[PDB]
Design a protein around this ligand. Structure first.
Ligand SMILES: Nc1ncnc2c1ncn2[C@@H]1O[C@H](COP(=O)(O)O)[C@@H](O)[C@H]1O
Ligand SMILES: [Ca+2]
Ligand SMILES: [Ca+2]
Ligand SMILES: [Cl-]
Ligand SMILES: [Mg+2]
Ligand SMILES: [Mg+2]
Length: 414
């Protein structure tokens, strides 16, 4: 475990939910701010708790809440995560009341990418709804972040503190029968998508009694007038997600790959991205030239101590390279991105041999950037190798890296 009070100062409260309370805290050395969920230990239901929390920490996906550490004192567990300032997707729906097909697809693609990644890691959300999706900031096209999952097996929730009425719109019919498989998240995501495009829940009613009665029948329609102005492709995706029988309901990956999603997720590099692509390429080569000790040390600092404001350019590059929208870079995506980079420069990729091809270059690189051997370059691995090492050289950040384990320490990093 570890000592929370030594490392962090509590600044203010941010919210209260089912499992505990969420506060803003500040790292005493770096002054970097974080969100911390504080859970009373008597609420447990600590060895297996830390084991399941460890899996949560290693989730590394741009649309999933990022957790940095779990600390403990005599009364509480502290789960310290990235701080998001844009509020709940719920509030954005209220303000806009509904979204263009282009805007809805961009939002729901991120939900699909996050849920796919969760399911591949054997995690079911079980309460997916707009109140549990935060915007990372107030910036226009910012990433959304799925929150509020993973603790239901280890800790006792207070049913009162959860917004039951809100949840009811979103629950799959099999949940009313005691079932919580992966497919229930797909149904909830389909309710979200229905709402993004129409502004209205597909299963609706005055109060919770009428809503749940409609959920149990599974019956919904595209009868509202605004559905006449919405494409058949979007309706086809919704019909596949809101299938009554979970066995016939499509998977999250099939959601992510649906043609309607692909049409509006064509982000690809352009001439204006060349400065940052060139920046990323130089830093990656330097990273791939440093020894296994330096590399693992750099990954640790980039993934835990960098800020959203410092990774924003690299996050846009990552998204443009991520052709299949799953929030990870596979071998072919790096090869294609390399080819696109050269094309944008006006350079024939065959000039490289005069001393190997893009394909040989990437295949030699994959074992060095995929430090965890996952088969793909996750977000934190890309940032660590592509970030300018200069920003990681902050004295405060070195101080924090040291304290987690000095004059010699600083030189070794340098
Ligand atoms: N990472 C975060 N950044 C900012 N606010 C958060 C974060 N996590 C939770 N919150 C706030 O705390 C509330 C309850 O959190 P939760 O119990 O995880 O649903 C959320 O609805 C947000 O208002
Ligand atoms: Ca990908
Ligand atoms: Ca990996
Ligand atoms: Cl949490
Ligand atoms: Mg205490
Ligand atoms: Mg919540």
């Amino acid at each position: 475990m570890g000592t929370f009070a030594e490392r962090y100062n509590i600044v203010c409260m941010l919210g209260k939910g089912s499992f505990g309370e969420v506060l803003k805290c500040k790292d005493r050395i770096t002054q970097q701010e974080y969100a911390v969920k504080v859970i009373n230990k008597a609420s447990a239901k600590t060895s297996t708790i830390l084991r399941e929390v460890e899996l949560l920490k290693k989730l590394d996906h741009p649309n999933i809440m990022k957790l940095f550490e779990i600390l403990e004192d005599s009364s509480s567990f502290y789960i310290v995560g990235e701080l998001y300032t844009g509020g709940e997707l719920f509030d954005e729906i209220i303000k806009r009341k509904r979204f263009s097909e282009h805007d809805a697809a961009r939002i729901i693609k991120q939900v699909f990418s996050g849920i796919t990644y969760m399911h591949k890691h054997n995690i079911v959300h079980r309460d997916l709804k707009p109140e549990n999706i935060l915007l990372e900031s107030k910036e226009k096209d910012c990433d959304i972040k799925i929150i509020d999952f993973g603790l239901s097996t280890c800790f006792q929730q207070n049913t009162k503190m959860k917004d039951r009425i809100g949840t009811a719109y979103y629950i799959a019919p099999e949940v009313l029968r005691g079932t919580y498989d992966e497919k229930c998240d797909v149904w909830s995501a389909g309710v979200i998508l229905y709402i993004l495009l129409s502004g209205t829940p597909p299963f609706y009613g005055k109060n919770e009694y009428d809503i749940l009665k409609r959920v149990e029948t599974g019956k919904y329609a595209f009868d509202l007038p605004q559905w006449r102005t919405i494409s058949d492709d979007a309706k086809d995706l919704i019909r596949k997600m809101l299938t009554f029988h979970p066995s016939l309901r499509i998977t999250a990956t099939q959601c992510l790959e649906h043609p309607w999603i692909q049409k509006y997720s064509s982000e690809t590099p352009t001439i204006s991205d060349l400065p940052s692509l060139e920046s990323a390429m130089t830093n990656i080569r330097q990273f791939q030239a440093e020894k296994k000790l330096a590399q693992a040390a750099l990954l640790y600092m980039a993934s835990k101590l960098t800020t959203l404001d410092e990774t924003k350019q690299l996050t846009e590059i990552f998204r443009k390279l991520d052709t299949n929208n799953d929030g990870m870079l596979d071998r072919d995506e790096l090869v294609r991105g390399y080819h696109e980079f050269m094309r944008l420069k006006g350079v024939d990729s065959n000039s490289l041999i005069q001393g190997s091809t893009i394909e040989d270059q990437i295949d030699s690189l994959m074992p060095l950037l995929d430090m965890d051997g996952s088969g793909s370059i996750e977000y934190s691995e890309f940032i660590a190798s592509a970030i300018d090492r200069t920003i990681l050289l902050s004295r405060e950040r070195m101080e924090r890296a040291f304290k987690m384990f000095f004059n010699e320490f600083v030189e070794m990093l340098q």
